[PDB]
Structure formats: C-alpha cells, structure tokens
Ligand binder design. Sequence first.
Ligand SMILES: *[C@@H]1O[C@H](CO)[C@@H](O[C@@H]2O[C@H](CO)[C@@H](O[C@@H]3O[C@H](CO)[C@@H](O[C@@H]4O[C@H](CO)[C@@H](O)[C@H](O)[C@H]4NC(C)=O)[C@H](O)[C@H]3NC(C)=O)[C@H](O)[C@H]2NC(C)=O)[C@H](O)[C@H]1NC(C)=O
Ligand SMILES: *[C@@H]1O[C@H](CO)[C@@H](O[C@@H]2O[C@H](CO)[C@@H](O[C@@H]3O[C@H](CO)[C@@H](O)[C@H](O)[C@H]3NC(C)=O)[C@H](O)[C@H]2NC(C)=O)[C@H](O)[C@H]1NC(C)=O
Ligand SMILES: *[C@@H]1O[C@H](CO)[C@@H](O[C@@H]2O[C@H](CO)[C@@H](O)[C@H](O)[C@H]2NC(C)=O)[C@H](O)[C@H]1NC(C)=O
Ligand SMILES: *[C@@H]1O[C@H](CO)[C@@H](O[C@@H]2O[C@H](CO)[C@@H](O)[C@H](O)[C@H]2NC(C)=O)[C@H](O)[C@H]1NC(C)=O
Ligand SMILES: *[C@@H]1O[C@H](CO)[C@@H](O[C@@H]2O[C@H](CO)[C@@H](O)[C@H](O)[C@H]2NC(C)=O)[C@H](O)[C@H]1NC(C)=O
Ligand SMILES: *[C@@H]1O[C@H](CO)[C@@H](O[C@@H]2O[C@H](CO)[C@@H](O)[C@H](O)[C@H]2NC(C)=O)[C@H](O)[C@H]1NC(C)=O
Ligand code: NAG
Ligand code: CA
Ligand code: CA
Lengths: 96, 48, 48, 948
Amino acid sequence: LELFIGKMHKTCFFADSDIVAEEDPAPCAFSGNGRQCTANGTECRSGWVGPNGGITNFDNFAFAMLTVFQCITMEGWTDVLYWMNDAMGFELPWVY
Amino acid sequence: QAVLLLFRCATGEAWQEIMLACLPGKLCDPESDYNPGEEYTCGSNFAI
Amino acid sequence: GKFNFDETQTKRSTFDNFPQALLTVFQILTGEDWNAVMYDGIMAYGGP
Amino acid sequence: FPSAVTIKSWVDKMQEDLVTLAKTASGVNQLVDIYEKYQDLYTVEPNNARQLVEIAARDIEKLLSNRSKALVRLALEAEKVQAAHQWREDFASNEVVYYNAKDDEPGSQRIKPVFIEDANFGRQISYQHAAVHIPTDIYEGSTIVLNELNWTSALDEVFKKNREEDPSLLWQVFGSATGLARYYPASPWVKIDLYDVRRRPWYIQGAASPKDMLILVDVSGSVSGLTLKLIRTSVSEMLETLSDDDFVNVASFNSNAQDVSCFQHLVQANVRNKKVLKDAVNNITAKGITDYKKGFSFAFEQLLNYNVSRANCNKIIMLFTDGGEERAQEIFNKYNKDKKVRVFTFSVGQHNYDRGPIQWMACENKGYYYEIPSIGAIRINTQEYLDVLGRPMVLAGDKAKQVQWTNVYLDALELGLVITGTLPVFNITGQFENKTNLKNQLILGVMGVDVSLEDIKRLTPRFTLCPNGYYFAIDPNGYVLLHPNLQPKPIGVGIPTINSQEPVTLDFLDAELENDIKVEIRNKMIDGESGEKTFRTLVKSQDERYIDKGNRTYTWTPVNGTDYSLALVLPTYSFYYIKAKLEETITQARYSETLKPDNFEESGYTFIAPRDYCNDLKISDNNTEFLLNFNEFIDRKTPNNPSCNADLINRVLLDAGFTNELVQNYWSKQKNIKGVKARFVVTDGGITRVYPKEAGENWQENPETYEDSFYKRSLDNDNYVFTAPYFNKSGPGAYESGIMVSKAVEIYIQGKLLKPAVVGIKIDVNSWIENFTKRNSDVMDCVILDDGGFLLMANHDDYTNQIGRFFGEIDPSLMRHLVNISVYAFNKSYDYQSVCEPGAASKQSCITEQTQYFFDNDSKSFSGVLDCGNCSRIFHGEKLMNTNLIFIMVESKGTCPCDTRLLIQAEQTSDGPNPCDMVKQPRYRKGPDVCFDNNVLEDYTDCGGVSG
Ligand SMILES: *[C@@H]1O[C@H](CO)[C@@H](O[C@@H]2O[C@H](CO)[C@@H](O[C@@H]3O[C@H](CO)[C@@H](O[C@@H]4O[C@H](CO)[C@@H](O)[C@H](O)[C@H]4NC(C)=O)[C@H](O)[C@H]3NC(C)=O)[C@H](O)[C@H]2NC(C)=O)[C@H](O)[C@H]1NC(C)=O
Ligand SMILES: *[C@@H]1O[C@H](CO)[C@@H](O[C@@H]2O[C@H](CO)[C@@H](O[C@@H]3O[C@H](CO)[C@@H](O)[C@H](O)[C@H]3NC(C)=O)[C@H](O)[C@H]2NC(C)=O)[C@H](O)[C@H]1NC(C)=O
Ligand SMILES: *[C@@H]1O[C@H](CO)[C@@H](O[C@@H]2O[C@H](CO)[C@@H](O)[C@H](O)[C@H]2NC(C)=O)[C@H](O)[C@H]1NC(C)=O
Ligand SMILES: *[C@@H]1O[C@H](CO)[C@@H](O[C@@H]2O[C@H](CO)[C@@H](O)[C@H](O)[C@H]2NC(C)=O)[C@H](O)[C@H]1NC(C)=O
Ligand SMILES: *[C@@H]1O[C@H](CO)[C@@H](O[C@@H]2O[C@H](CO)[C@@H](O)[C@H](O)[C@H]2NC(C)=O)[C@H](O)[C@H]1NC(C)=O
Ligand SMILES: *[C@@H]1O[C@H](CO)[C@@H](O[C@@H]2O[C@H](CO)[C@@H](O)[C@H](O)[C@H]2NC(C)=O)[C@H](O)[C@H]1NC(C)=O
Ligand SMILES: *[C@@H]1O[C@H](CO)[C@@H](O)[C@H](O)[C@H]1NC(C)=O
Ligand SMILES: [Ca+2]
Ligand SMILES: [Ca+2]
C-alpha cells in the first residue's frame, strides 16, 4: 500500500476517445518512469478499471491482502510484477 | 534479466511457453549484427 | 451457470455440471491457474 | 394607430410603385409582342396527354423485352452447357484460365486484360472476356469452384453475342450457387470486400417465391451469454434476406410466448419495419424456462390470422434455439398435419445439449437443420434456407421461368440507380433419361441483366412539356420506378446517433405531396387500369420553401409488358407547345451569332441549358465552357444536323433571336434605372440572359431552365412572384444581388394559351428602403412578407440586416398568431433522402420533416389584436394586388416583454412517421400472383443431418 497505490490505472486509449488501444492492456508510467505507448494514434491517461478488471491492485487493504496471497502461492506472481515494470520503473518492484 | 527469467522458471510460471519462444524460427532485434537477407535465424533447438 | 457474463468467449473451467465441476476443483487443487477461476467467480457476483 | 382606410391607401400606393416598375423595366408585354408578331418561325403543336403515355409505355415495354430475350438466351445456354460437364477432380494438368476481379494457383491461370475506358460505364472495361468475382470467405482453387469455372466459361460467347445485338446493354451477370459471380464486360472489382452474390436482392427473388416468415427466438435462461449474442446477430442477418414482397414477424418464448415488438402480426418487411424488428431483437434478455408447446402454438396461430395483408405463399417458421428434450408432437399434429408450414431449426452457440428433438422438428415438417457455433457461421447458414424453398420451383419446370424485375437500388459497381432482370437456372444433368434426380432439385444459379434508370428516362422526353410537367412510373408495391424526386441516395430511417446495401424504395405518396385524391389515383395505377383525372392540387416548389396550388391532369396506363404503370403529369396551359420551323440559312446563322461571349456587352450575359442535343457535344455541368463548345459546334458542322435532332437545337436557336430582340430593342434604350439592379429573361428553349454583363456574376440560378425554382413558381401564378433571398450569407445575396421578381409571359396564337418564358428584374434593396419610409422607429413596426412568411422589407435597419429570413424566427409571437387567424396555412412533409447530422446518444442519411407556408384565405384585409399576456398589440395586415406580398404593421415588440419559442421553418431532423400504427392501416398493394410451394414430387428426405 505504501510503496504504490492506484498506480495501475493509466492505460493507453486512442486519441480523443474512450476506447482502449490494445486487446490486452497494460499500465503506462505513473509519472514518466515506466512504460509509454509509442503508437501514433494513442495517448494514455487515468480512467482504467485495472489489470484483471480491478481484482489485482494494491489500492485497498482487502485488495492488497488478496494480491499478496496470490503471489505467495507462486501462481500468477510474475503478472503482478510485470504490470509494475510498466506502472513504474524496473528498480523498485523487483525487490518487493 | 536472464537471472530473473530462470527464477521465473524455478517457480514454474510458464516455463513451457518460454521454451516454445526460443525455437529457431524467431525474429532478431536490429541492434544485433546479422548478415543481410536473413531475419528469422536466431533461436536454437537446444531450447528443449 | 453464472460464468456466462463475458458474452464474448466460452469459459472451459466452469461448474456447469458435476463432471466439469469435478475437473475444475481438481485443477484448483493442483494450484494451476487457480486465480483465473477465482476471478471468474468474483466477476460472476458483481465484480471488485 | 392609423385607421384601416388610411393604411389601405398607403399600401395601395406601394402596389403600383412595385408592379409598374416590374411591368416596365422587365418588359413583360414587350416580349409578348415579339412572340405574337411573328407566328411564322414557329408552329403551335398539340401536346396530347393520352398518345404520349401510350407511346412511352410501349417504348418502356420494348426496352424490357430486349432484356427478357437476353435473359432467356443466357439461361437456356447455361443449362445446356452445364448438362454436358464431366466433373473431374484434377485441374493441375488441364488448368482453367479466367480473369479474377480484385487482383493486381493449383489449376488456375490468370488473365491480364487491357481495360479501355468507355461511355455509359464510369469505369474501365474490356469486351474481350468476362470477369469472375469470388468472395473472400470462399477459396478459389477448390474442386467445387474449379469445376464451376469450366461450364461457366461457355457463357462468355453468349455474353458477347448479346452485346452485339444490343450495344446499349449494361452488366449481365451469372450468380452461382457455389458463390462466384461471372459478369460481362470484365471490369476490376470496387476497405475489405464483403460482397456475396447469393445475398443480393436480385439473386434472392429468383431463388424462391415470397414467404410469410415467423422467427421464434428462444429466450430461456440457458441461452444467456455468448449464445444469445449469436442469436441476435443471426436474426438480424436473416432479416437482410427479405424484401418488400415477404412478410415477417419475430416472436420469443420463455414459459410464455410473446412478440418482441409492437407489430403483433406479419408486416411487409420493408426498410422501416425491419428496422423496428432489428431494434427489438437487439433488446431481448434471457430468463425463465423453455416451453416449445407454448412457443409453437403462438407461431402457428399467427400464420392463420387472415385479417391482415400477407404473401399467401411459403409459410415457414425459423426456430432459433440451442437444444432441449421437448418434441411437441401434439402441437405439430394439431396445427400442421398436412405439412402446409415448413419448420427450419437452428442450433446456435457452443453447447452440449440435445440436438435430437431440434433435428426431428426440421424434417417432420419439410425443413432443414442448421448449426451456428460461431460468428463466422452466421453469414452462410442464414441464407441456405433458400435452397429448400426453391425445391417446388424447379419441379414446376418451364412455367417457373418468368422474368422478374427488382426494386430500384444502387449498382454494386458504381453505376447509379438500376433495376435487374432475373431468371433461375436449373440442373438438368441426366434429365433426358431421369436417372439421378437427387441433386437436380436445386437451382444452378440466377441470371441477371441490369437496366439503368437513365435508360428509362431517355424513353420519356420532357422538353416538349412544361417545366411543371413530368412522367412517373409506379410499382405494385406503390414504389416509384421513375420520379423527379427520386435521388441516387439511400433512404434513411430513424435518427442517426453514434458516439447502401438496401434498395431505394420510395413510395409514390412520399415522392410528392400526399393528397386524398392521389391515393385513389395510386390505387387505380396499382391494379393496372388506364384513366385520366383533372383536379386542383397544391405543389411544393423546387426549393422546399414555397407551396402553390394549380390545376394538374394525371393520365396513366398500364404497361402490358410488366407490372409497372406509367403516368404523365401535365398541367393546363401546356397542352400546346412551340415547335420551331425554320430551315433557311441566314435567318438561323444570325441567331447563332447572339451566343458569342464577346457579344455579351450588348446582348447581355447569356447562358444555355446543358441538354443532350447529341453525342458529339458533351455537357460540362458548368456552362463556362459548354457555351464555347456549343457555339463552336454548330458553325463547325453542317446545319442539316445529319446525326441528331434539330428540334432541340431549332428551339434554343429560335429563342436566341427572341431574347436578343428584347435586349436590343427595349433593354438597351434604358441603360440604367434607379430601382433596378438586373434584368433577366428565362426561356423554355434553355437560355437565360442578364442585361448588365457585370450582373451575370451574381446569377446563382441553374443554367437548366427546367430546374429553376422561380421559373416553375411563375408559371403557376397569374401575377408577379417575389423570391426571397437566402439567409446565412449563402453567397452574395444580401445587398449586392437584389430581390428577384418574375412574371411569366402569356401569348395567344389561335386562342390557345402558352407560357414560353418568364421575365423579371432584381430590385435594389437600398432603393426600396427609401421609398418604403417616404424609419427605425421605436414604437411602430412595418415589415413586408411574401407568400411563405419570408422577410423582404423592414422598418428598423436591424430586421433588414437579416434579410430573407422566416418571420417566425424574428417575431415568433406575431407569426404564430397569423397562422391561428388563418392567414398562413402550412403542410408538413417527410424527406426520406437527405444528408443528416449525427447526434449524441461526415454526415449520414436520415428523415427530415419539411414545412412550408402559404396563403390560406382569399381575403385581403386583416386586422386584430395580439394578446401576449398582461399587454396588448394591435395589428393590421393588407395584401398587395397582383403579387404574393403582404404588408403588416405592428407595435414594437419591446412594449410587451414577452418572447416565446421561435417558430422554425427549416430542415428539421425527425424519425417519423411512427410505424407501429402505420401497419394497422397499411397502404394498398398487390402482390405477385405466382406461388410455387407444396409440390408432392419433392423429396425432402435429407433432413438436415444425414452427414451427422
Ligand atoms: C447437378 O447434378 C449432378 C447430379 O444430378 C451433379 O453431378 C454429381 O456431382 C457429384 C459431386 O458434386 C459427383 O459425386 C461423385 O461421388 C462422390 C460424392 O461426393 C465423390 O467422392 C467423394 O465423396 C465424398 C463424400 O463424403 C466427398 O467428401 C469427397 O470430396 C469426394 N471426392 C473424393 C474423395 O475425391 C466423387 O469424387 C464425385 N465425383 C466423381 C465420382 O467424379 C457425382 O458423381 C455427380 N453425378 C453425376 C451424374 O454427374 C452436379 O454436380 C450438379 N451440378 C452442380 C453445379 O452442382
Ligand atoms: C473444362 O476443362 C476441360 C479440360 O481443359 C476442357 O476440355 C478440353 O477442351 C479442349 C479445347 O476445346 C479440348 O481440346 C480439343 O478438343 C477437341 C474437341 O473434341 C478435340 O479435337 C480434342 O479433344 C482437342 N484437340 C486437340 C488436343 O488437338 C479437349 O479435348 C478438352 N478435354 C480435355 C482436355 O480433356 C473444357 O472445355 C472445360 N470446360 C468447358 C465448359 O469448356
Ligand atoms: C508513426 O510515427 C510517426 C508519427 O508519430 C510517423 O512519422 C511521421 O511523423 C510526423 C509527425 O507527426 C507525421 O507528420 C508524418 O505523417 C509521419 N509519417 C511520415 C513522415 O511518413 C511514422 O511514419 C508513423 N509510422 C507509421 C505510420 O507506420
Ligand atoms: C396493352 O394492351 C391493351 C389491350 O391488350 C391495349 O388496349 C388497346 O386500346 C386501344 C384503345 O385504347 C383499343 O383500340 C385496342 O383494341 C386495345 N387492345 C386490344 C387488344 O383490345 C393497350 O394499348 C396496350 N398498351 C400499350 C401501351 O400499347
Ligand atoms: C379476423 O380474425 C379473427 C381471429 O383472429 C376472426 O375472429 C373473429 O373476431 C371478431 C372480433 O372479435 C368477431 O367477429 C368474432 O369474435 C370472431 N369470429 C367471427 C366469425 O367473426 C375474424 O373472423 C377475422 N375476420 C374479421 C373480418 O375480423
Ligand atoms: C395540406 O394543406 C392544409 C394545410 O393547412 C391541410 O388541409 C386542410 O386541413 C384542414 C384541417 O383538417 C381542413 O379543415 C381543410 O379543409 C383542409 N384543406 C383542404 C382539404 O383543402 C392539410 O394539412 C393538408 N391537406 C390535405 C392533406 O389534404
Ligand atoms: C430492342 O428494343 C427496340 C425498342 O426499344 C426494338 O426496336 C428492337 O427491335 C429490339 N431488339 C433489338 C435487337 O434491338
Ligand atoms: Ca503455474
Ligand atoms: Ca433452455
């Protein structure tokens, strides 16, 4: 919760529209640190439900409880890691 | 990055999917130095 | 019968009948993709 | 407030202040003198409304008899050639050669053609061979397709032979049941391609007879999810295979059977009714249990209604479900024990239910069984039911080989509005000895030949009639094959709210203004009986702003060739026309010299109508270069006109001398007038002239005389007509153009009335203000409106700024009161072909409501008091003599602080009329009298699942 909360909410939509550009969206950088969609007709801002439809995020204790327990069983723990290398840089999330 | 990939396979996440991605018929990044006229050459049958 | 919310694809790990529900519980028991079934169960009851 | 007597004199003074100026400056009586004093360069010929329609109908019938012979010559050869096919399964050695459209191979070799350009063909074509179109979803090079490319290669010789006999032949196409379409002449195919010949309206009508469908949609709980999205897309796709001759209704059942829409019975399945059904199908939800007995009883009862208009043909039920265990044997035994109704069943979605009962219903009732597991299966499975319906049609024999004609639709290869002849092709292999007879109950395909609407328009000339006279042809369904108001645009339905494969079916009552007397005329035309009728109509102007009343005469006869009926609308004062008779040299060469642009200084800026005099002179649609082409054509050519008619050329040349004699002898004497900014004459021949050559730059009228709105309004009216300038700065018209005034000339030769031309002037707006005042008063308002409530004069220097505007948009309180006190009437109409701005939920096509205002009463003095609430305004309206103007004087709107909603007279986007109550009293129509169903020799032993 402390290191990151609400970061996975910026996916790249099309320019002047509300349609997600790619079929399997991933977050952009929170503030210019992680991933930027370089597609020409797309730009990214806030207003995304989440990676797994909102199930997988750290923006609430109940959600943080569920995401961590998912990663302690070693099932779908790299997906949460890889969604952070997009939301933020490569330096912080790999340690966590 | 290579060490993290092996740690990914140690826990068994999608190690069979990574292996399929390393078969010979794969594209090579332009930064590498390869002879012209051949693009899908990198990748080896030793991935199995 | 509550896994019909997607309207764009057919879920295969469901609880539609006893033989299929018996395979899904076995799949969760082995721990493989147990979270993917859990997401469908959560989305079947409203969502996050 | 001035008394009625004194204000009557004031408006009386302006009457001859305007009429006398327009009577003298334009020279209305002087052009009449020119026409009457000669009476030797032209003759007055009768214009018989009965013989014209008789001649035109026979020419139209002969045109469709050219094509019927071509269709027979093509279908007859296709059956013979296909019957001698061996069906080999190896084409690698004996490769087939053909030209494939939309291109830049196991056993196929391609052809690279030459593609020379040609007239009456907006593309590049080649007569050396035929093109073959194969849909994307169909793989060329398979055994079925390659075997089809052999026996269809013999069609090219017949294709060439047909064109040799009739050079004026458009696309002739063979639509195969395998999918490929072969057409002549070869031309490259026109995003991705989604064309399938088997889903085209011209293919569908020849593949079967009309049908009374009733779609049952299973909306029980088990269909929720993906298999409901597939069902909704499947039902919408099957509605696309229906035309105006088929009657459909959609119903759903889940423990209770009910209609999904507002219709409650079978409806005509036109473009509007199908939109209602499609919208309702896309709004159904899945819930409850399944009850086939209640769902099939409801379906069978609706097919026995017979209060309503139906097709009286194939009665079929399409069941859209997934699976189940109910067979409903009792319902089928009770409702169709003699198998009068077919049942087609569909198993939609990815499920593992029981398909046994679903398959049993299919062939216990002479149907067929289909599976639609994914979106890719929707396109093909929803059109295969026409194979079953055509079984009794092939067993009929040669009595089913009748040529039919489609509705008006836009050609797929960008050719315009066309209609298509149709003829099915039968599989008669072994028919000589009748030994296989198993695959011979399916049609090989459908023949087709296209006829352009421009071809039909050439057989009905209109330049001998008044610009107010026209032809129009009708359909048994009531739609117009021919009409001035039919446009090459799709007809819209509803409101386009988003965040051309349908036919252009425009009804006769929607093409023009609907009347209680047109309905009985339309019904008399539909059942095919000749007649005539003279009666008073009210006619909408060319620009949808004005409505005027005039005598009209409708003369109609049936075309025995087809089911069409042709009528000619001819007003009074047009039963005679001027036919130029002059063959002398010098009297015609001088008239031609008046068309020279360098002579415009004294002869005025001269236009000429872009008419098809003959082929070697091509129109330009700008008149800047057409005049140069025209006048350098006549002199550089023999005057005898060896290859083309002199009637259309002698007429325009004759009127050149007449207009010149008016410009020179009268208009030149008065070089300038204070109240005149321009002087124009427009003639039936097709030339308009403006005396000040610099004033010809402000001419915005169509160079074609018959398409001039002010010309047509002047003929109907017996007095001067004032044309309001357009608003919203649509070009220069505010102050630098003037106010258009026109009056038709009337001549008498042997006691016969004729109206050959109109004359008029463009009154300067600035000069009119000075006379009107003799200003910006804050107490009293003085405005002048025309027939239609458009502002022309004012008394504020602020209303005058917004010139040519509907008076309801600048004074709604006063305008609305004038309607109620019966000064202005108004007819409202619907325009089904119009560009439409999308709204929130380029431009699309939708329906716009058109309203026009006109003088209701014949009285001239109007007075009263307007009670807007806690105030009072007194008015007095007087109408000027010998014109369509009205003068009204009111107090300033600032005295009473009320400003109600503004009265709008413009193109208002609408979605009406409501179709729920339209189907309760539908318009009269007559359906086809040939029905091919219920043949006892039909096999129907392959239920739907012989291979699974
Ligand atoms: C007009 O009607 C005539 C008959 O009235 C029809 O001619 C018949 O055409 C069929 C093929 O469409 C020929 O069928 C032969 O026999 C079988 C039937 O399929 C084929 O053998 C395999 O059968 C399996 C069945 O599951 C099939 O999947 C497979 O593709 C077939 N081929 C293989 C395995 O190579 C034969 O190959 C096929 N062809 C032969 C033997 O040459 C009939 O023999 C034809 N009958 C006659 C009297 O000619 C004709 O097609 C109809 N016209 C049109 C346009 O459809
Ligand atoms: C479907 O493909 C078939 C195979 O190509 C076509 O059949 C072949 O057409 C050739 C051209 O007419 C024939 O060549 C000549 O045919 C005449 C007529 O009987 C004969 O003199 C000889 O057979 C031949 N002449 C020579 C070789 O000098 C082929 O005989 C004929 N059959 C084959 C090749 O098996 C069909 O024409 C085509 N379908 C249609 C409808 O055209
Ligand atoms: C995608 O990247 C850029 C656009 O972001 C394209 O390169 C040019 O970029 C300028 C700047 O906006 C445009 O005006 C040009 O139209 C672009 N195209 C040129 C010059 O050919 C780049 O080509 C795009 N890649 C594509 C379209 O494949
Ligand atoms: C269509 O056929 C009818 C009848 O077959 C034609 O009617 C003829 O009308 C004229 C006078 O109007 C009569 O003198 C003839 O005797 C009628 N024909 C017959 C066979 O009796 C009608 O003219 C035909 N339509 C066209 C456009 O020619
Ligand atoms: C129209 O169909 C109805 C049934 O759908 C027929 O039944 C009649 O309905 C009217 C209205 O109630 C009544 O006359 C009787 O109740 C019904 N029977 C008869 C014999 O009339 C009806 O006959 C059909 N035709 C008409 C003209 O209504
Ligand atoms: C078009 O013309 C007028 C528009 O004002 C209307 O016809 C009149 O309608 C009123 C009200 O029903 C009648 O009292 C008049 O007798 C009608 N005028 C006639 C019959 O000349 C109506 O909107 C349209 N007229 C039609 C459809 O006939
Ligand atoms: C075609 O129709 C015309 C009438 O339009 C007729 O004169 C002619 O005989 C018909 N046949 C041919 C081959 O032109
Ligand atoms: Ca795993
Ligand atoms: Ca069910």
